[PDB]
Amino acid sequence: ASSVHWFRKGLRLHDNPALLAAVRGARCVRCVYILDPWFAASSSVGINRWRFLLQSLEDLDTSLRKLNSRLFVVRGQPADVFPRLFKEWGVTRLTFEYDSEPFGKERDAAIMKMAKEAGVEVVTENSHTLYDLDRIIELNGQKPPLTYKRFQALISRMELPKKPAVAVSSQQMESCRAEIQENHDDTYGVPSLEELGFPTEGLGPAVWQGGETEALARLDKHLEANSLLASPTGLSPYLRFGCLSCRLFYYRLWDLYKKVKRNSTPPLSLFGQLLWREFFYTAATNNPRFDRMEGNPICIQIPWDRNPEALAKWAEGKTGFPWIDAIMTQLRQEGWIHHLARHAVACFLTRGDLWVSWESGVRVFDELLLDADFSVNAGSWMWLSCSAFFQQFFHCYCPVGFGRRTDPSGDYIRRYLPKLKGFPSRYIYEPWNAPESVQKAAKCIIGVDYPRPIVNHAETSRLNIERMKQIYQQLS
Numbered sequence: 524a525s526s527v528h529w530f531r532k533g534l535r536l537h538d539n540p541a542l543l544a545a546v547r548g549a550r551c552v553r554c555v556y557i558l559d560p561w562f563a564a565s566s567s568v569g570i571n572r573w574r575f576l577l578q579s580l581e582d583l584d585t586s587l588r589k590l591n592s593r594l595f596v597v598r599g600q601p602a603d604v605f606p607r608l609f610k611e612w613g614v615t616r617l618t619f620e621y622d623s624e625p626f627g628k629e630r631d632a633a634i635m636k637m638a639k640e641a642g643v644e645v646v647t648e649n650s651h652t653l654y655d656l657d658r659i660i661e662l663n664g665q666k667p668p669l670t671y672k673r674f675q676a677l678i679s680r681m682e683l684p685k686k687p688a689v690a691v692s693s694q695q696m697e698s699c700r701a702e703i704q705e706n707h708d709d710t711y712g713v714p715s716l717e718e719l720g721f722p723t724e725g726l727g728p729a730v731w732q733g734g735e736t737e738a739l740a741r742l743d744k745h746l747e748a749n750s751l752l753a754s755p756t757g758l759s760p761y762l763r764f765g766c767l768s769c770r771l772f773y774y775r776l777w778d779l780y781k782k783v784k785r786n787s788t789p790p791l792s793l794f795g796q797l798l799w800r801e802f803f804y805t806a807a808t809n810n811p812r813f814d815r816m817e818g819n820p821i822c823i824q825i826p827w828d829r830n831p832e833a834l835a836k837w838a839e840g841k842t843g844f845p846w847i848d849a850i851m852t853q854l855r856q857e858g859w860i861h862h863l864a865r866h867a868v869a870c871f872l873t874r875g876d877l878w879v880s881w882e883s884g885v886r887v888f889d890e891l892l893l894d895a896d897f898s899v900n901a902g903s904w905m906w907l908s909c910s911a912f913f914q915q916f917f918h919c920y921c922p923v924g925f926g927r928r929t930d931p932s933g934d935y936i937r938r939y940l941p942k943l944k945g946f947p948s949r950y951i952y953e954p955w956n957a958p959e960s961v962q963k964a965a966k967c968i969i970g971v972d973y974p975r976p977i978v979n980h981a982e983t984s985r986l987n988i989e990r991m992k993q994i995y996q997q998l999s
């Protein structure tokens with residue numbers, strides 16, 4: 524065979540059954556990522572996620588150089604690039620990891636249809652998720668489960684997730700080395716941020732370095748107030764790009780449990796984090812409108828306020844609430860925030876305060892999060908906004924109290940909002956309540972150096988609970 528492995532997600536060599544299928548009885552294999560630099564140039568996704576991708580592709584190229592191959596980064600779109608590749612390379616086989624997302628499913632059907640009309644064998648494997656999403660849906664009567672316990676109940680009737688596949692070996696990549704064009708292969712070199720049209724003046728080191736190598740080092744390190752800060756053990760961005768396999772993560776947790784607890788089978792709760800991901804993957808896959816309200820079959824139609832101004836303040840960290848604003852700032856700057864911080868800002872935007880559609884929240888998170896995941900992101904926003912999944916009521920977060928309770932020192936705020944450095948702890952979560960004297964001593968006048976709160980939380984959250992109540996009454 525003359526094989527191409529197409530990377531999209533699954534940005535790794537370990538647990539890559541699709542790559543193994545590419546190399547099996549192959550004369551030649553080439554690993555490609557297809558990247559349209561003019562699409563990248565116009566994309567509204569911010570630099571952090573774009574940077575993470577490039578760094579992941581850099582690491583993949585470094586891993587391939589140790590197997591005496593290289594990554595081929597091909598400039599263009601799959602549709603008008605593949606036919607050129609199929610001929611120029613004499614391609615016999617095309618492989619890739621399965622994409623369960625409605626758009627991805629769509630694109631890939633078109634790619635394999637063209638591949639069949641070209642005499643090219645296509646092989647896919649579903650290694651991005653723990654389970655075969657389609658099987659879960661079949662077991663549920665051809666609809667996805669819309670509650671977590673129903674999901675868990677389906678999961679309990681199925682075989683355990685597949686174990687991580689054996690990684691391609693140092694010598695198996697010898698029997699089908701690609702022919703590297705000397706120093707000309709940099710026509711397939713990994714693009715820089717400047718190439719992708721990003722300004723990079725005073726950038727500085729990534730807090731979250733992309734790539735498989737980093738993913739595996741982070742997972743190994745973990746298996747052994749400040750929780751708001753970026754840990755050297757956050758795996759979400761790695762899972763999202765497939766730098767880390769979810770299956771390896773699952774069974775490595777399993778092994779950890781078996782060593783710590785000995786004579787014990789782990790509870791489903793050990794794997795809850797990965798299972799929540801699976802749950803949203805399952806709900807999303809047959810729903811082309813999953814990230815919308817209108818025309819979304821599982822979403823309650825809610826008359827959210829159209830308030831572009833409020834949305835911009837929320838997005839820009841200019842609400843009047845230091846906890847909210849510090850979160851949005853860390854998000855924009857670093858591209859990762861804690862789960863509880865995500866809940867806090869999402870609640871504020873939607874049913875807790877601003878009454879703005881969860882859809883606008885999804886879009887802001889998609890632009891800023893390193894781990895921005897179509898399935899998980901939209902699912903999370905729908906769930907917490909009580910828009911889907913039979914939720915109806917949810918966790919109540921005070922845009923003052925919740926920060927006070929998570930970090931009483933206020934040091935988190937002082938880090939992300941240095942203008943508020945000077946306020947004592949008893950005021951820093953609600954500086955509008957500091958006396959003028961305290962404000963002056965902190966060298967930050969509220970309404971001048973930092974905005975007044977943009978809503979009265981007490982009254983607005985009260986108004987909203989009645990609005991939500993009115994929606995579910997007429998609903999039934």
Ligand SMILES: Cc1cc2nc3c(=O)[nH]c(=O)nc-3n(C[C@H](O)[C@H](O)[C@H](O)COP(=O)(O)OP(=O)(O)OC[C@H]3O[C@@H](n4cnc5c(N)ncnc54)[C@H](O)[C@@H]3O)c2cc1C
Binds near residue numbers: 901
């Ligand atoms: C509004 C909102 C939006 C979100 N958007 C995203 C998103 O775009 N991408 C994303 O990956 N996660 C999203 N999450 C889930 C969660 O907040 C992050 O996955 C988690 O904070 C990452 O932290 P961690 O890596 O330390 O997770 P860990 O505690 O290490 O959990 C391990 C992995 O499990 C997954 N996970 C954990 N919790 C959840 C959950 N509740 N739902 C689904 N998956 C989970 C993540 O992939 C994470 O890497 C969102 C949550 C909310 C409330």
